[PDB]
Design a protein around this ligand. Structure first.
Ligand SMILES: COc1cc(/C=C/C(=O)OC[C@@H]2O[C@@H](O[C@@H]3[C@@H](O)[C@H](O[C@@H]4CO[C@@H](O)[C@H](O)[C@H]4O)OC[C@H]3O[C@@H]3OC[C@@H](O)[C@H](O)[C@H]3O)[C@@H](O)[C@H]2O)ccc1O
Ligand SMILES: O[C@@H]1[C@@H](O)[C@H](O[C@@H]2CO[C@@H](O)[C@H](O)[C@H]2O)OC[C@H]1O
Ligand code: NA
Length: 195
């Protein structure tokens, strides 16, 4: 059954944790579906990110499938946080008009995982929204060298590769298969599972 949300919220739905966040402009209809599924549509937003997964991240292997429709700036990524240090992390499989993280990403190397090759970056967010309120913190990124929509993400491969280039993860907070939009409009329909 469906539960559509329009304001930032976290919780559990059909055995899966979810996180949904947007800043004030525009509209996101973040619709919780059966099992590990959610849909999104966004319009006129500034920034939003949300999806289904786990309240506490781990080295679990995560599989996802579905559709991602982003003519402007959007991302389809495994997405999560740690505390101590505060870290926002991404394993980006697809994107819209703009390949992240841009020039604010420092290239650190590559990792091969799940049939793909990913570029590794560190970026810094300055006085930016976070799971602990406005903060200044690093992001760790793996970004697939070409787009893919669907498959398995062997998280351990990414975590180990980041560690090998000095990117230390803290205590795991949430870990979700996320859709992100930036100053754009679009939609997605994504189903997650582990193991
Ligand atoms: C005051 O509080 C605050 C602070 C921030 C931001 C803090 C910060 O450190 O970064 C500021 C800038 O945001 C990033 O921006 C990206 C933006 O440049 C990019 O635009 C592309 C550029 O090319 C064009 O051709 C594209 O059409 C256009 O879309 O889009 C992505 C932006 O970055 C995203 O921002 C949101 C994060 O969640 C994502 O991780 C990140 O990828 C940096 O490059 C800085 O220039 C924000 C909000 C508040 O309130
Ligand atoms: O109310 C708080 C939320 O606003 C906060 O949400 C985070 C804000 O930064 C976004 O980049 C994240 O995706 C989102 O989780 O989390 C903590 C909560 O208490
Ligand atoms: Na992967």
């Amino acid at each position: 059954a469906q539960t559509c949300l329009t304001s930032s919220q976290t919780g559990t739905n059909n055995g899966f944790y979810y996180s949904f966040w947007k800043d004030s402009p525009g509209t996101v209809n973040f619709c919780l579906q059966s099992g590990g599924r959610y849909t999104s549509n966004w319009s006129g937003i500034n920034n939003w990110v949300g999806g289904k997964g786990w309240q506490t991240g781990s080295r679990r292997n995560i599989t996802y499938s579905g559709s991602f429709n982003s003519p402007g700036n959007g991302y389809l990524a495994l997405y999560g946080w740690t505390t101590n240090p505060l870290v926002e992390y991404y394993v980006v499989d697809s994107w819209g008009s703009w390949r992240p993280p841009g020039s604010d990403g420092t290239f650190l190397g590559t990792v091969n995982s799940d049939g793909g090759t990913y570029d590794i970056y560190r970026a810094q967010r300055v006085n930016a929204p976070s799971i602990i309120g406005n903060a200044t913190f690093y992001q760790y990124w793996s970004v697939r060298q070409s787009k893919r929509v669907g498959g398995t993400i062997t998280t351990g491969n990414h975590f180990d590769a980041w560690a090998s280039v000095g990117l230390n993860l803290g205590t795991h907070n949430y870990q979700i298969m996320a859709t992100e939009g930036y100053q754009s409009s679009g939609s997605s329909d994504i189903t997650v599972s582990e193991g």
